[PDB]
Design a protein around this motif. Structure first.
Motif, mmCIF file in Angstrom:
data_model
loop_
_atom_site.group_PDB
_atom_site.id
_atom_site.type_symbol
_atom_site.label_atom_id
_atom_site.label_comp_id
_atom_site.label_asym_id
_atom_site.label_seq_id
_atom_site.Cartn_x
_atom_site.Cartn_y
_atom_site.Cartn_z
ATOM 1 N N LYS A 279 25.163 73.960 52.590
ATOM 2 C CA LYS A 279 24.548 74.631 51.388
ATOM 3 C C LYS A 279 23.291 75.333 51.701
ATOM 4 C CE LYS A 279 21.364 74.173 47.826
ATOM 5 N NZ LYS A 279 19.829 74.207 48.095
ATOM 6 N N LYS A 280 22.342 74.665 52.734
ATOM 7 C CA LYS A 280 21.172 75.306 53.282
ATOM 8 C C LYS A 280 21.362 76.557 54.226
ATOM 9 C CE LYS A 280 16.536 75.384 52.791
ATOM 10 N NZ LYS A 280 15.612 74.209 53.316
ATOM 11 N N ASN A 281 20.187 77.318 54.347
ATOM 12 C CA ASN A 281 20.478 78.524 55.111
ATOM 13 C C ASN A 281 19.322 78.591 56.193
ATOM 14 O OD1 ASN A 281 22.569 79.823 53.963
ATOM 15 N ND2 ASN A 281 21.222 80.663 52.139
ATOM 16 N N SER A 282 18.405 77.470 56.181
ATOM 17 C CA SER A 282 17.453 77.265 57.174
ATOM 18 C C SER A 282 16.935 75.707 57.506
ATOM 19 C CB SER A 282 16.039 77.973 56.803
ATOM 20 O OG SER A 282 15.180 77.701 57.705
ATOM 21 N N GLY A 283 17.978 74.935 57.666
ATOM 22 C CA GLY A 283 17.933 73.637 57.706
ATOM 23 C C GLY A 283 18.054 73.265 59.372
ATOM 24 N N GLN A 284 16.915 73.167 60.012
ATOM 25 C CA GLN A 284 16.971 73.501 61.687
ATOM 26 C C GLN A 284 16.174 71.948 62.079
ATOM 27 O OE1 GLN A 284 18.200 75.658 63.913
ATOM 28 N NE2 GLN A 284 19.415 75.834 61.906
ATOM 29 N N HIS A 285 17.042 71.587 63.089
ATOM 30 C CA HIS A 285 16.414 70.524 63.805
ATOM 31 C C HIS A 285 16.076 69.276 62.980
ATOM 32 C CE1 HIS A 285 16.535 72.434 67.690
ATOM 33 N NE2 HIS A 285 15.673 73.507 67.116
ATOM 34 N N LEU A 286 16.766 68.912 61.915
ATOM 35 C CA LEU A 286 16.933 67.846 61.019
ATOM 36 C C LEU A 286 17.540 66.608 61.818
ATOM 37 C CD1 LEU A 286 17.769 69.747 57.771
ATOM 38 C CD2 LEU A 286 15.582 69.377 58.823
ATOM 39 N N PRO A 287 16.781 65.670 61.886
ATOM 40 C CA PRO A 287 17.309 64.592 62.762
ATOM 41 C C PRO A 287 17.983 63.361 62.122
ATOM 42 C CG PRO A 287 15.059 64.153 62.442
ATOM 43 C CD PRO A 287 15.476 65.404 61.816
ATOM 44 N N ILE A 288 18.694 62.584 62.686
ATOM 45 C CA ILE A 288 19.325 61.343 61.908
ATOM 46 C C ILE A 288 18.958 60.198 62.546
ATOM 47 C CG2 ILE A 288 21.298 62.764 60.871
ATOM 48 C CD1 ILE A 288 23.085 61.658 63.258
ATOM 49 N N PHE A 289 18.895 59.013 62.147
ATOM 50 C CA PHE A 289 18.475 57.817 62.601
ATOM 51 C C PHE A 289 19.957 57.323 63.377
ATOM 52 C CE2 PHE A 289 15.598 56.760 59.116
ATOM 53 C CZ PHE A 289 14.390 57.667 59.644
ATOM 54 N N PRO A 290 19.825 56.755 64.696
ATOM 55 C CA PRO A 290 20.985 56.200 65.321
ATOM 56 C C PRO A 290 21.369 54.951 64.561
ATOM 57 C CG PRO A 290 18.827 56.031 66.685
ATOM 58 C CD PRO A 290 18.616 56.801 65.571
ATOM 59 N N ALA A 291 22.487 54.510 65.006
ATOM 60 C CA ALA A 291 23.234 53.432 64.499
ATOM 61 C C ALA A 291 22.729 52.171 64.734
ATOM 62 C CB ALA A 291 24.879 53.561 64.805
ATOM 63 N N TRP A 292 22.190 51.761 66.066
ATOM 64 C CA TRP A 292 21.824 50.485 66.379
ATOM 65 C C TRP A 292 20.440 49.912 65.563
ATOM 66 C CZ3 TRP A 292 23.066 54.659 69.600
ATOM 67 C CH2 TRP A 292 22.142 55.029 70.209
ATOM 68 N N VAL A 293 19.843 51.011 64.943
ATOM 69 C CA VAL A 293 18.882 50.543 63.955
ATOM 70 C C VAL A 293 19.364 49.800 62.841
ATOM 71 C CG1 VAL A 293 17.001 51.496 62.350
ATOM 72 C CG2 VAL A 293 17.435 52.516 64.627
ATOM 73 N N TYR A 294 20.639 50.154 62.184
ATOM 74 C CA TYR A 294 21.167 49.271 61.197
ATOM 75 C C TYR A 294 22.096 47.964 61.923
ATOM 76 C CZ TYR A 294 20.880 54.434 59.926
ATOM 77 O OH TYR A 294 20.341 55.481 59.393
ATOM 78 N N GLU A 295 22.604 48.134 63.028
ATOM 79 C CA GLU A 295 23.409 47.258 63.563
ATOM 80 C C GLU A 295 22.703 45.881 63.834
ATOM 81 O OE1 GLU A 295 26.013 50.505 65.638
ATOM 82 O OE2 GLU A 295 25.681 48.736 66.972
ATOM 83 N N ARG A 296 21.542 45.953 64.177
ATOM 84 C CA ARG A 296 20.798 44.580 64.615
ATOM 85 C C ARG A 296 20.131 43.855 63.471
ATOM 86 N NH1 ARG A 296 23.239 46.224 69.076
ATOM 87 N NH2 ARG A 296 22.341 46.608 70.773
ATOM 88 N N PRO A 297 20.202 42.615 63.648
ATOM 89 C CA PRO A 297 19.615 41.832 62.529
ATOM 90 C C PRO A 297 18.534 41.496 62.738
ATOM 91 C CG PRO A 297 21.016 40.365 63.863
ATOM 92 C CD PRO A 297 21.099 41.697 64.390
ATOM 93 N N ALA A 298 17.487 42.303 63.316
ATOM 94 C CA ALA A 298 16.113 42.094 63.207
ATOM 95 C C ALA A 298 15.101 43.349 63.085
ATOM 96 C CB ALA A 298 15.659 41.479 64.559
ATOM 97 N N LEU A 299 16.000 44.600 63.351
ATOM 98 C CA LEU A 299 15.499 45.731 62.709
ATOM 99 C C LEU A 299 15.668 45.978 61.135
ATOM 100 C CD1 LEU A 299 16.420 47.903 65.858
ATOM 101 C CD2 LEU A 299 14.169 47.437 65.122
ATOM 102 N N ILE A 300 16.533 45.125 60.519
ATOM 103 C CA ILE A 300 16.486 45.024 59.224
ATOM 104 C C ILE A 300 15.971 43.769 58.658
ATOM 105 C CG2 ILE A 300 18.529 46.560 59.401
ATOM 106 C CD1 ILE A 300 20.328 44.371 59.068
ATOM 107 N N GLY A 301 15.784 43.793 57.320
ATOM 108 C CA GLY A 301 15.321 42.677 56.606
ATOM 109 C C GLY A 301 16.261 41.413 56.362
ATOM 110 N N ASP A 302 17.381 41.663 56.650
ATOM 111 C CA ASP A 302 18.526 40.883 56.182
ATOM 112 C C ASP A 302 19.348 40.385 57.524
ATOM 113 O OD1 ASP A 302 20.633 39.437 54.624
ATOM 114 O OD2 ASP A 302 21.781 41.389 54.814
ATOM 115 N N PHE A 303 19.446 39.011 57.651
ATOM 116 C CA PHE A 303 20.333 38.498 58.699
ATOM 117 C C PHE A 303 21.625 38.708 58.435
ATOM 118 C CE2 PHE A 303 20.142 35.540 62.499
ATOM 119 C CZ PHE A 303 21.217 35.217 62.392
#
Lengths: 121, 229, 53
Positions: B18-42
């Protein structure tokens, strides 16, 4: 106090965000790392944004020092891949203008639009 | 968690075209979500054989840890860290008088885990600028629940708390967790993102006007999510 | 064993120096403890993992 749990709770979230930040900045340098810090101030949490924006104020200080030596003088500086222009190191004479400067497309950050980087080049 | 890795890439590709200038837009890597200490829920023993006035302190302290998604010692948080549903296993013995009130407090734990996983996945860069601020502002309403839990654990250590006091203290927070959990399940279920999760927050605010305990929540959630819009 | 030893151990895993009754046996996840005493660690040991991270 449940073994200092209440004391550590205010640094507890401050440990969560930084420990995530070491993994979002994983293997990056230059403008890409500045984007990986700017990502956590695209968030709408006030505490996360106020925590991260300080680190962001420190992190883009060499980048903007290279930026103010490229608008005012005309010759950039970096020591690794850190700068949004990838200069031609080969000499030109009076045909300097056409070939000397081309846009690096890895170190334009996310707090700078592509229009800005092209114009600054 | 497991199912979200698909959804992220599909919804990113739509808005990237859709966008015409969305440039170097990062995404968070998956092991931020995978580990049960980088999230608030065991160690663990059958609670039924102990005296009456010790089982009370036991199941209350264990329940206070169960509210935020982790085992205490005798009531266990079952390991999933996936969908909008979580289950807990209370021990099959307890004194009946304690046990009924424990069961009445237990839904707010399953109404925290499902909230927090939605807060983890949709604060990223593939669900739209308003949904990111929405999950980031539901994170604040989960922060207040955590502050409440820390104060209750502190008072319970110094012998100033019981299951009746705990039951009285968590009722407004039980309402806050129920509203956020229903909203999280609904936004995940219809694959809503962007402004379709700025309309649902408007409808929920109109729904409650007879409480003023949930009305102020819904008003605050709508105010915070529409700041990027 | 008394509670004060556990207090002294938990105060060091914030520094990232391991305790005695609480130790890091796996590095992918948090410290693991080696009755109200045990229950504090399931929140507290995560902070040692994150500080080390």
């Amino acid at each position: 106090l449940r073994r200092l749990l209440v004391w550590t709770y205010d640094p507890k979230i401050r440990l969560k965000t930084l420990a995530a930040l070491v993994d979002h900045c994983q293997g990056r340098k230059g403008g890409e790392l500045a984007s990986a810090v700017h990502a956590y101030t695209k968030t709408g949490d006030p505490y996360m944004r106020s925590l991260v924006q300080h680190i962001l104020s420190l992190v883009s200080h060499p980048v903007l020092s290279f930026l103010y030596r490229w608008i005012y003088d005309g010759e950039l500086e970096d020591t690794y891949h850190e700068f949004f222009v990838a200069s031609d190191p080969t000499v030109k004479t009076d045909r300097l203008w056409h070939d000397k400067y081309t846009l690096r497309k890895s170190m334009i950050p996310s707090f700078m639009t592509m229009d800005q980087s092209r114009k600054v080049l | 968690l497991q199912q979200s890795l698909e959804l992220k890439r599909k919804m990113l590709r739509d808005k990237q075209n859709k966008k015409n200038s969305g440039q170097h837009l990062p995404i968070f890597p998956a092991w931020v979500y995978e580990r049960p200490a980088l999230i608030g829920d065991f160690t663990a023993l059958p609670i039924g054989t102990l005296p009456l006035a010790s089982q009370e302190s036991a199941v209350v302290e264990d329940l206070l840890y169960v509210l935020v998604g982790v085992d205490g010692r005798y009531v266990s948080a079952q390991p999933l860290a996936g969908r909008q549903s979580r289950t807990f296993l209370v021990d099959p013995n307890l004194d009946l008088s304690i046990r009924e009130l424990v069961h009445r407090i237990l839904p707010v734990a399953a109404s925290y885990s499902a909230v927090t996983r939605f807060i983890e996945e949709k604060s990223s860069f593939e669900y739209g600028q308003v949904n990111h601020a929405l999950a980031a502002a539901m994170r604040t309403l989960v922060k207040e629940h955590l502050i409440l839990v820390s104060q209750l654990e502190q008072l319970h250590r110094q012998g100033l708390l019981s299951l009746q006091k705990l039951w009285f203290y968590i009722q407004p927070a039980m309402r806050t967790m129920d509203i956020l959990a229903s909203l999280a399940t609904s936004v995940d279920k219809g694959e809503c993102l962007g402004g379709s999760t700025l309309s649902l927050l408007h409808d929920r605010s109109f729904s409650y006007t007879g409480d003023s305990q949930a009305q102020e929540l819904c008003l605050y959630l709508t105010k915070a999510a529409s700041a990027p819009y | 064993i008394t509670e004060a030893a556990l207090v002294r151990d938990i105060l060091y895993v914030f520094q990232g120096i391991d305790g005695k009754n609480i130790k890091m046996n796996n590095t992918e996840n948090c410290y693991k403890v080696e009755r109200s005493l045990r229950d504090t660690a399931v929140r507290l040991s995560e902070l040692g993992w994150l500080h080390n991270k």
